[PDB]
RNA sequence: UUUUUUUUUUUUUUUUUUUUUUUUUUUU
């Protein structure tokens, strides 16, 4: 022939290894709240006073959401003259075009050991709290209602299983929020509105910035789940509920 | 690594309940504030704002807050004055701050007066019995109106009847909406509720207009029977929206 | 609780006058045309050779559309520059964007006698022709040829019973042409297509620029309505003809 | 009233002139394309070399479509080279928006004659060809299998009944053709399609540049009518499966 | 009637010599993409390390789309200093716009004896795999979730019908694919969905790349059919499934 | 990333050789 299949037919015989595909693999994937990077901007500005910084915009996602300019309009004037000042020192963005993006989402994302702490003291002020979400689900317990949670969920170190039935307890949050926080997924279907955050959650879940010792000892501390590692009866009531319609 | 340690230090610090309940106040989600938009109507008009309001008003239930675009399409003696009261209030066509003032923004924070008025305006409405007198038989005009969702009551009466004029308030703005945005034009009757289902709730819900006066300004207007129970239109607007 | 809500329920309560809110509501009322501002418009700015510029304006719209862009490539280019050259002398728009806004129609639209009789003048060049015409109805007159009639039609001084059927009768010459200026629009139902220029035309016969005491007298003048105040033979037919799918 | 009421019953009062008007409606009355304008840039740049120019051009409009710069990026570098002179050499315009607009669409619609004599010997390289469209009729002839046809269909010389059948035979090509060609019309009706391309076909009957008397000449040589006058066996059968969807 | 009417047909009735009018109807055909145009790039610009660096751009088509400055704004430090410094060198673009641009997926899909096995390992980390759609058919061959494996269809040496199941269990894939990758395809009928990639489709199986007596040996070496040359039971199932939505 | 936002046409629609599609495609 020529070198037209020639060569396309020969690079067939070199046989595939899997750990080096794979490392091509997990060295380009999908995340986009990456904590290494996140973190350096709020630190390095702020010698001490990043501490009592980072817990203004980290709650003001945790309330409210991400678009810093329709919401400061629609802010106190109190709020807005701070939030706006802290708009400037940094250059918040409300749209992750980039991962190195500064966004108060990702820093509540990056900062969950606190942030589902913070849902569990901050229900009733939550985009989705009691009043709506309580009646879809029995008993919830307040921890899970959050949306930076999904990367303290385990997997590793604790049995598969119990990951498998908390990521639906988890996924049962998410389609409350999205379809009240979103329009467009309201009336969606049941497997259309879990199709808007594969991505999102299961980049958390498989992030290894934490580590698996940190989150099981404090998913026991807050009763999430019980002694033997199993989640709590109000976890699986959940997972259940999310089973049927 | 050691960014990886001061995360977990981070979370295992106490946190504050009062100072976080202090944020979160301040955070809370504020809205439309009646009582600010009539400070500035007030404030700036010291004796015509009676006279002004209104002008502004029946410009808001005829046409939209488009203020430039709907100034050159009407009649000279109404442009006049209106681009006069355009510069004394400073009117903006959207709303982008809770202090912005956009003619549909004084529809909604005047009830009792812009909803009255609509009630002898039947053929001058953006939608009314041109439109949508195929679908209901006798509709109160006394509710079609933009802002008829902030009168509607939840306390002081029966559940069922907040649900049945709610009922029947969505039919006469399903026509509203359809007929005044292009894209949602020829969409699913789901879309409609779930397009709407916020704004509606919002003015519902506010206590800014007392609860007391809803039930006997709409006791007057015929809305309510004596007893109680919504007229004979509200059911069959009721009847007739469920059904498509 | 507060004062300031109390007003606003007195504010409210008071008894509404009428009257005057009707002298607001039409007051309010949209107004796409202004017969006095298309020829103030005119007369200010080329009233030096307005007498012949209109001229070439209006049957530029008695034989084609308001596209200039589109026209101007497709007529005959000895005289398209003196369009494009009158394009700028004037501002003529192909959209009525603002009142101020002028396009062919509406200079046609606002001297509804002369473009009658140059329609009479120059039948074979409309856009639809009077062979077409003729197979629909027999000796059709052509000045009520024209789609400035809407405006000349008369709505008082004559009797409401007999201006019905001239205006079923204009109504046929604009279903064909309405049917012929627009593809989309054939092969569709009779009251459909009567329904695309059903309102316009209303809002032109009902119009109070132009006065009715001389509307009837160009009226009797052309042969359409005779002496005694009746229509013609060609009026009656051409309405029974419209009368009948 | 005013001056505006005076100066629309003075102007509609004024002796219009009749040759004044007429002048302008003939001046306003506009031709699609006269295959002689076409003809006169194209013989008039080439000297000798146009006879294969045009060859060259004939068969891309018929092969690939009225796009250049769409196709050069997708067919051969060999032809790519010559092709990209063509379009300097005539400035070929994408799009026709004037009647001065040269397109090679324009040029194959030009010479009637030799467009589709070249689409009957090169069945298989038609955007529609047979194998695409003998499920709809048998036995088509190659010779209509062009979108040049439309223009060789006379008027004069042959009754009106063959012409219906003509004008019917190739509308099914057409159906076939603006179905497949245009995205947003193929999920049209049946009615939606001969409106489509109503006019535009009737424009080349009707048209006077290319004379009826080799019309029939032409086709009786190629088959497609018969010595008699009449259309052949294949015209019927196309024209009556176009009657039924 | 005319000097320029009859120079027009003069030449238009001239009899065609069909080895001068086909000679441009393959110099004017359609060749899309050209396997082995986009090979020699890579071999010409990295032809000491072409054989890593090509690794990496088939997984990024593995494991992404084509979008290079969407992806890489939300993915690794590592690997976006090696993927653009891999973009100047080999100059790939997000949009094909010629037959000589060369996209990231292009590369993959010219080489499919290694993505075919690539995507195998990286079941788990496809946009669309089995963890999504083992519901659908069990035991799916692993091999399948990737966008180069119809390249190597094959056309001779097996019944056709054969084909059609390879065709067929190769078309719930982009079912699966394009209807969660699209937005505007979610929720389109099973006609309309077939039609989007059944173009491309074609086009690949019908390639003359890849000799037919190697596609065999690598497909029988896959285990997917066995030796007697008729297809696994894992097609089969997949038959089912298809031909009821 | 919604929680009182959406103002469409409203005496306009403007055709008489126009539309050039797909043919290893898109990653929201």
């Known amino acids: 022939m020529s070198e037209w299949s020639r060569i396309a037919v020969e690079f ?47 709650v003001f996602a945790l309330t409210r959401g991400n678009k810093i300019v329709k919401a400061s309009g629609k802010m106190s004037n109190s709020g807005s003259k701070r939030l706006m000042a802290l708009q400037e020192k940094y250059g918040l963005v409300e749209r992750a075009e980039t991962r190195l993006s500064i966004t108060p989402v990702r820093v509540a994302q990056s900062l969950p050991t606190w942030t589902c702490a913070a849902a569990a003291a901050l229900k009733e002020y939550l985009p989705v709290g ?37 990521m639906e307890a988890y996924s049962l949050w998410q389609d409350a929020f999205t379809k009240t926080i979103n329009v467009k997924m309201r009336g969606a279907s049941k497997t259309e509105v879990y199709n808007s955050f594969r991505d999102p959650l299961h980049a958390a879940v498989n992030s290894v910035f934490f580590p698996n010792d940190v989150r099981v000892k404090w998913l026991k501390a807050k009763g999430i789940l019980g002694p033997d590692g199993v989640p709590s009866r109000a976890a699986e009531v959940a997972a259940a509920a999310y089973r049927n319609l």
């Open 130 to 166: 009691p009043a709506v979400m309580n009646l879809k689900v029995e008993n919830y317990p307040p921890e899970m209602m959050c949306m930076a949670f999904g990367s303290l969920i385990p997997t590793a170190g604790v049995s598969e299983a119990t990951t498998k039935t908390l």
């Open 12 to 58: 067939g015989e070199q046989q595939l290894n899997l750990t080096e595909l794979e490392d091509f693999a997990r060295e380009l994937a999908y995340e986009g709240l990456d904590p290494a990077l996140i973190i350096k901007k709020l630190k390095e500005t702020g010698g001490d006073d990043w501490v009592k910084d980072t817990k203004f915009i980290i």
